[PDB]
Design a protein around this ligand. Structure first.
Ligand code: HEM
Ligand code: HEM
Ligand SMILES: [Cl-]
Ligand SMILES: [Cl-]
Lengths: 482, 482, 482, 482
């Protein structure tokens, strides 16, 4: 029971010395434990995630505290006090596997709720917005923010050339360059679904919805100087903090709140409600409390439960659906796809990914089939056994459409600057000074014409925002005020 | 259960019609069930086995009937009446996935015994010998007996050019060209370990051993004409027979018998006891009966239990070990290697491959890790927790060695023809004529110089053997006389 | 040079005998040539195709004979006498690698044209129609026509339960049960795109199109009895014929003809023009001649050129596009998905799949990257280098849409029987008798209620069609005439 | 030029906006550029190396300066002034992709020489020795020095529990805890083959050999405090240095020197000459200058040329071979094994891995076969076409052997401490204080019984070594005495 065996269950007699042809002779092929042990060792590693490769996870419990059942029939939300198992992974974005935790970056805020009608995956971020309006730009973002093909290092030129070429990116650039760019720990940041999603209620009415997760620990951040110091001591600071806190029974909590928009308002609101680079004003759609979750159990094995974790935005549950946010649409393809490659087609048989409700999922065979493959069950539908029966009671209402099939130009909406301006305007002088200093030092070494492209965008958001950065870089106002 | 869900447990509402932009419009990406179902479908297939790709499997039970505990300490054989669950896979060799069952070919006779001290895999054949003396020639044999690189069809010239270049191959060539080359069913053929292996007893004494599995149904074969007729009707004849026999409770049995040679005898016998192209004469080493098995249960799912089955000759149990047969030696590497590629590093977690005894196998991580991965258990040994403790009481005795590390030429042993001669001499005239006819027709269209090479080898086995084929082909006796 | 080396170019001295500790000792691990040779051998096999696994390929040339540039701007059709190289693969559907060539089945008719504006893949069939109207049924078809999960054999019950559950399948069921179900060779069958596609001209006007490939060798078929005799002798009959025909310089040819439907007609025609189970009457849309191709070159290596060939219906070229045929829509996802799994992400660097025109494809990294990965070229767009510039001149016209996003029920169109009834009406008494016999024998052993379901459908197509099978099965007319 | 196409060479019209059902409608599946672009993106990542994942590479040139042709027939050394092109990768050991360059760790020093008789791979380290005597302990070392299964962080307890269990590890622990544990740059460290290898001359005589690479830039190191400050600023410090140095034409250089031991001396020397934890004293075998290499080209693409680089210790060339060092013997299996998994079976067709000399490597098929697969060339040997002809002229002489096949206990050699003591004795008082300090801070938080185990080992090496650490930890000399 601490006794070593082979994978086939044979006792291992020799784990210290290989078999050789005499004391000083070469090694024998028939040391098969050596061959097995090293062959499994040689295959421990699987591909990292193409985005958010560096991260930390924990298990917890979501509890309903308020009634939103008029808007959604989702079983997770059905009764006050109702508890649901869940799993969260927090992460950086650009960093690879052993990259520093405490970098200036978006943080992933990824939740799996093990509901009675399926795993609901909400792969959120610590920001309500993102850089892009169209998912075609996503591989380009990755290539701009990660390592240069030649230098194998991040390139400020590549990063800023790309960002300055997409004025719609200004909102999230501002957020990442602000004081919230480096949370002090994963417990001291908020979470967001970011996208507009939808709620479907008992009567098949549709509402557009935003998910908000409010930290009960409050917001705490690190300056570039504090982060560099921390990173020099510990590339694993945020993992360390999450693990230690839960082991110390200091369980972090977040309050789920939602914004809910009747289907019809989408046609009338002054902002595109499906634009990922924009929020819905709280004045227009106030936050509505729903419940809270708390993270209260560390995984026993990081590789099995965290590295192998897969969150798919397409994994929704009755009462929760998508929206025509083009960014969300693209994500409906890319995650299942990336996860089948990264983890194997049968990766939902990995415990962390498995439903904790009845599952009868049809798909047969595939690599590493360990669940019995449904035994002798026939594989085709329609069939004379009524096997693999669809469930029409769960059918969503149609969605009205208007206009031709085409590549519609998102730049028809040129409101790239007002929401960033609003954000900047709300900052204290200290927060504005931090913003300015972070941006200016990030722009160091970046070719002047790219710098000026950014300063111009900041100016259009708010003249004080452009000027704050322009002054630090040594530009005359005339260079960026047109 | 009948109701259809996604892999994440979400009810599936539409399994008949995809989502489109209007009745006559193009398909929408947000049909996420379509993407999941097709993405899994697209990944059902895994690589087939490189050898013995076509096969049939069943479960059964082995029972000890005689006491051989004087020679082996293996728990499987420890008590008369002791029963052990097992899995068997029968197969052709050259045929791919949907190739005909009823071909002229060796048949695989592969057994997995779920013992209390590990899974014992014996991947045997329906013949006591093989074509080759050295494992380097194995890929060459595959390339000669399978599809030509250009034609994509088997090539008589490739096959016979290769066979005629290895005079040692004559024993197994004679067998495959004899009436035994096409068993009528898997139930009407014998099985053999083929290789010399070893038994180790309670006092750590070593014996060399051969395993023999004698069909209790007896031997039944098909002629080329009968097999062709059958194949034309049914490429699945042997699967159908095996499955149907078991479904009608006519369970096939085999009797295990062994030859046992004291270790010291191997230096004194007139033949090489580790030459896979040779048998041990029954006169020198009589068959010693051990027990019997029956196959009494069909797999519920063929892909998960038969296709994914992995038999590795290196999976031995205490009391059973290997020998210096170079062919056996090469197989100690190749199977685990082939199986990690074909099935994944964690394939021993697939139920058919899993031990039924205690397993504490050390290896961590790897693709599709579903077993918990030993949780938080440390991964290194030596350690201060007594974890992963080796088991020195199961240590095998040393093997004495003599001579330098070198590529010793097996052709020092030029006894290529005497055992084929003995086999031929024991055939009735009808069996000899069948041999002559099968060989002559197999050699059809093969260049004459290659045909002559084979006829010469046959003549050297027995003059009547060479002449029997020589006459059919129109050769003058002086052409192969010398 | 024919001298043997390692993969790293080191001379190999010993390819006949492995290195051992003495003449009769165990094998040494340091025989690294053995390890490398067997490790590569162990990895020769990749997954077969999930459908059409069994096949044959050849290179050839397409030549334009007629002017259709009024309808399409595609460069392949731009000038009379213009030659374009191509590769074709013909195949069965249900058979695995190694299954019989001469089975009753659809034949794949897959073409890759190496045009100056990209590879145009047309993955067609030897039939103008198919069994299904909706791509969700495809994995079900696979599972119904291939091996039973338990028996590992084809199942008449599974196949016919499935087909009788889909009355729309009757058209293709009729075709596959007719004398055309077994082509005598690949050269003696027609090819079809089957789907409605589109042509776009210089003025961006869209026409709907069907592609027809008319065999210049004529149609030749085999009966079940003739096919059985052939299979019994040769599982590779159609490969043998194609290879041998091309080596003998008897190059097979087909004439490309098209049906062309103005965009506005689609709304007015009495049949759904995007229904894969229906053809467009030649009376309404006569065949328009375009050109011809001949296959004149056998591949040098079958694995590298044929097995590794990837045909993706999404690989269209300017002037050729898709249609809202839901079956074609589903294919736009499945192939590239299946192919990246089967062949690797970078399979388009395999010579057979590579374009023979300017290519600058942007995708970076991925497994087995051999093309240089664009060197130091930056990887993001937009960028300040004008790199990865889109080509707006090649933009397609918008497609007009109407109606809500929904899973629209295709069974709104209940015209299941008229086109099968028409096809039957065109058959001679002899061809009808063959159809009746083929169907009755195919329904042998199938549960009576399933048989009756098919006969009922055949009855509704034409009373004589139903009665022909009904008689052979011993049914009274009252059992199926309602 | 600079224009975007699909992988099949079709021009891409829309790279900014995905195709939707109207301006604000959901995304259409038929946007096939989106699917292709995202599917390739989703598959960019391959597994990182199991050890030495973090690294930097460059191309250079080796020049022979002096004559050692008396001892080796290797072509690379055959003539003074002879130039050989090459590639080098330098690396850390424990860090993943993204981990800091400037950690306390062994550095990998890995060389590929493109010789006229094969690629000679020499995967060395920046140290002449290593922690272990037996290759079975390698996965244990990985699991001890990398991330704990539960915490996902490195563990001082795990690491030192393991190192203190292996007294033989002291030599390398001393070196990694010394000032040379953090090279300032890759240019400012030495390289070593570490293992005893062999040289074979024109007369087939064998010499044992050690390879040394002496930095022409000198040795320069960073203290823990200096390294932490650097890491806080830049995780890519060593990549940055190597890249910029070469771009600045400041080409780093190393002189190759060898130690050469006649075969006979191996039995007479007072140290095991095949013990990887030991050096050969310069007193007995002085360094003999051979040539130098410079690194003078940065790779064009890091992924394709550095990440995909594979160095296999078994890739030796005529004139150079192995030794019975158990650790070297194990590496002969593991690297090819790991690389086939990580990179694909055909990874030696990746340009950096490709030989420039004649290559005729035999192996057929396998994933991503892009080289032509030897076209129609037959695949078996022996054959009648002279194909795949072995090269017996390059045969190596036999190695005399003595003793039984057994798992021989290396702890028969109890000389664990003398060489670490010799090294300690040669350090200045300042470098000794640095050693004490690095070690004592490394032991922080490690259970006292483990700490004491290490101090005991150090004392055995030299009383002042043990006392130096003992003092800093607050132990009395009597607690770790003798
Ligand atoms: C929703 C409908 C369909 C789906 C999802 C589907 C799926 C597939 C898949 C996954 C493959 C293997 C691809 C590969 O690995 O390269 C394949 C092969 C093939 N299919 Fe389809 N199929 C569909 C309908 C059709 C139709 C309607 C046709 C004819 C018009 C067709 C013709 C072919 C041919 C010719 C091949 C073999 C291509 C080759 O020679 O490599 N399929 N199919
Ligand atoms: C039992 C002993 C050892 C085993 C089993 C082992 C195993 C491995 C493995 C699996 C890798 C990753 C290989 C790849 O994916 O390309 C690796 C990398 C490496 N190892 Fe070893 N190792 C051993 C000892 C050593 C020793 C003694 C040295 C130095 C003399 C060394 C130097 C290196 C270097 C430099 C690399 C990275 C090669 C590169 O730059 O791509 N290793 N090792
Ligand atoms: Cl994949
Ligand atoms: Cl592998």
């Amino acid at each position: 029971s601490k006794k070593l065996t082979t994978a086939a269950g044979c006792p291992v007699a020799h784990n210290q010395n290989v078999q050789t042809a005499g004391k000083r002779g070469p090694q024998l092929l028939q040391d098969v434990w050596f061959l097995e042990k090293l062959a499994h060792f040689d295959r421990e590693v699987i591909p990292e995630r193409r985005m958010h490769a560096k991260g930390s996870g924990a298990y917890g419990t979501f509890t309903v505290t308020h009634d939103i059942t008029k808007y959604t029939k989702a079983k997770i939300f059905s009764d006050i006090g109702k508890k649901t198992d869940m799993f969260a992974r927090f992460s950086t974005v650009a960093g690879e596997r052993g990259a520093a935790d405490a970098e200036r970056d978006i943080r992933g805020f990824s939740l799996k709720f093990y509901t009675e009608e399926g795993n609901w995956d909400l792969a959120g971020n610590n920001t309500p917005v993102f850089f892009l309006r169209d998912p075609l730009k996503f591989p380009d973002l990755n290539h701009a923010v990660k390592r240069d093909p030649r230098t194998n290092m991040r390139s400020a030129k590549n990063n800023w050339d790309f960002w300055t070429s997409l004025p719609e990116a200004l909102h999230q650039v501002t957020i990442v360059m602000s004081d919230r760019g480096i949370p002090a720990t994963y417990r001291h940041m908020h979470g967001f679904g970011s996208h507009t999603f939808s709620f479907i209620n008992s009567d098949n009415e549709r509402y557009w919805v935003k998910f908000h997760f409010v930290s009960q620990q409050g917001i705490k951040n690190l300056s570039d100087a504090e982060a560099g110091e921390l990173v020099g001591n510990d590339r694993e600071s945020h993992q360390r903090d999450l693990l230690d806190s839960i082991d110390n029974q200091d369980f972090p909590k977040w309050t789920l709140k939602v914004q809910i928009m009747p289907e019809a308002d989408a046609a009338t609101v002054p902002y595109n409600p499906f634009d990922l680079t924009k929020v819905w004003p709280h004045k227009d759609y106030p936050l509505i409390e729903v419940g809270e979750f708390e993270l209260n159990r560390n995984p026993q094995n990081y590789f099995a439960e965290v590295e192998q974790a897969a969150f798919n935005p397409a994994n929704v549950v009755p009462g929760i659906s998508f929206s025509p946010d083009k960014m969300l649409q693209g994500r409906l393809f890319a995650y299942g796809d990336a996860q089948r490659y990264r983890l194997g087609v049968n990766h939902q048989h990995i415990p962390v990914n498995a439903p904790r409700c009845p599952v009868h999922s049809y798909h047969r065979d595939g690599a590493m089939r360990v669940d019995g493959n449904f035994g002798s069950t026939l594989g085709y539908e329609p069939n004379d056994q009524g096997q693999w029966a669809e469930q029409p009671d769960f059918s969503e209402p149609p969605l009205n459409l208007d206009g031709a099939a085409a590549h519609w130009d998102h730049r028809e909406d040129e409101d790239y600057f007002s929401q960033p301006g609003d954000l900047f305007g709300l900052m204290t002088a200290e927060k504005q000074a931090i913003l300015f200093d972070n941006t200016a030092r990030n722009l160091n070494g970046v070719p002047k014409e790219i710098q000026l492209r950014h300063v111009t965008h900041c100016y259009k958001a708010d003249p004080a925002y452009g000027e704050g950065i322009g002054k630090l870089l040594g530009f005359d106002i005339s260079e960026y005020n047109s």
